[PDB]
Design an enzyme around this catalytic site. Structure first.
Site, mmCIF file in Angstrom:
data_model
loop_
_atom_site.group_PDB
_atom_site.id
_atom_site.type_symbol
_atom_site.label_atom_id
_atom_site.label_comp_id
_atom_site.label_asym_id
_atom_site.label_seq_id
_atom_site.Cartn_x
_atom_site.Cartn_y
_atom_site.Cartn_z
ATOM 1 C CG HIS A 65 -0.501 0.559 2.631
ATOM 2 N ND1 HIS A 65 -0.232 -0.480 3.454
ATOM 3 C CD2 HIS A 65 -0.357 1.493 3.329
ATOM 4 C CE1 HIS A 65 0.179 0.352 4.536
ATOM 5 N NE2 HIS A 65 0.218 1.480 4.344
ATOM 6 C CG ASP A 117 0.189 -3.852 2.648
ATOM 7 O OD1 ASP A 117 0.767 -3.505 1.857
ATOM 8 O OD2 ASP A 117 -0.062 -3.303 3.987
ATOM 9 N N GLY A 127 2.776 6.730 8.954
ATOM 10 C CA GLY A 127 4.128 7.292 8.526
ATOM 11 C C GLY A 127 5.026 6.169 8.719
ATOM 12 C CB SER A 167 2.736 2.092 6.211
ATOM 13 O OG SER A 167 1.792 2.508 6.980
ATOM 14 N N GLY A 168 5.169 0.128 6.041
ATOM 15 C CA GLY A 168 6.259 -0.513 5.320
ATOM 16 C C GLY A 168 7.355 -0.555 6.021
#
Ligand SMILES: N=C(N)c1ccc2[nH]c(Cc3nc4ccccc4[nH]3)nc2c1
Ligand SMILES: [Ca+2]
Ligand SMILES: [Mg+2]
Length: 223
Positions: free
Chosen positions: A40, A84, A175, A177-178
């Site tokens: 995402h 994801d 902020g 995420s990932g």
């Protein structure tokens, strides 16, 4: 990261900041030419920033490399956020050193109760907005799938796990995420989603990396 602490400059050497004119997601360096992040967080025109601590100040240990290609998981579903995960190849190999290092992929999945380190430059307020300039860290355990599924009925798949505190107070946030969830020296998760940040009975949900090691290894060797 809400309720965490300042990591310290380059103490999480595999943490990357994905930038498209500003920081928008975190990522993990798995080897000199590849980064894993969340699907995402996909955007065209990503610059990978390695060796960062303050993302608004060039402190001397950074390496800014553009991505040559991005590969979102073949089965990523943006509506449920199932699968994801995405891989980003760097245009040039990074130079590994003390401040920039890769993190190992897991040989098995981690057990509930295992403590992990989650890091990122995401929001630090549960109710409010405050984005930090330096990297924040949080130690949190993996929760039982039962508590995870009870918090999010019909929304957790086998490719996800929850980590955090049901009491609230401590959690990853937007902020972040990932970014990485490292347990016992292996990358076991990717910050994916949750309901608000640090709310009671709403732990963070992470992509379960141990289910994607073959796909990762196969994809990087063929690209
Ligand atoms: N509490 C957490 N651990 C948490 C982490 C990351 C995050 N990011 C968002 C916003 C958010 N929700 C979505 C859904 C689908 C695509 C992008 C997206 N961004 N909330 C959260 C919550
Ligand atoms: Ca910097
Ligand atoms: Mg992060």
């Amino acid at each position: 990261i809400v309720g965490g602490y300042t990591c310290g400059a380059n103490t999480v050497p595999y943490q990357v900041s994905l930038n498209s004119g500003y920081h928008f997601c975190g990522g993990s360096l798995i080897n000199s030419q590849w980064v894993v992040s969340a699907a995402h967080c996909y955007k065209s025109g990503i610059q990978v920033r390695l060796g960062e601590d303050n993302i608004n100040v060039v402190e001397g240990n950074e390496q800014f490399i553009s991505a040559s290609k991005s590969i979102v998981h073949p089965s990523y579903n943006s509506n449920t956020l199932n699968n994801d995960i995405m891989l980003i190849k760097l245009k040039s190999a990074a130079s590994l050193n003390s401040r920039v290092a890769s993190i190992s992929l897991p040989t098995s999945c981690a057990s509930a109760g295992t403590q992990c380190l989650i890091s990122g430059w995401g929001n630090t307020k549960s109710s409010g907005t405050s984005y930090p300039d330096v990297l924040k860290c949080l130690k949190a355990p993996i929760l039982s799938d039962s508590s995870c599924k009870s918090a999010y009925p019909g929304q957790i798949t086998s490719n996800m796990f929850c980590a955090g505190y049901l009491e609230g107070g401590k959690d990853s946030c937007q902020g972040d995420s990932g970014g990485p969830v490292v347990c016992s020296g292996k990358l076991q998760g990717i910050v994916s989603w949750g309901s608000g940040c640090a709310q009671k009975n709403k732990p963070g949900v992470y992509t379960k990396v141990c289910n994607y090691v073959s796909w990762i290894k196969q994809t990087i060797a063929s690209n």
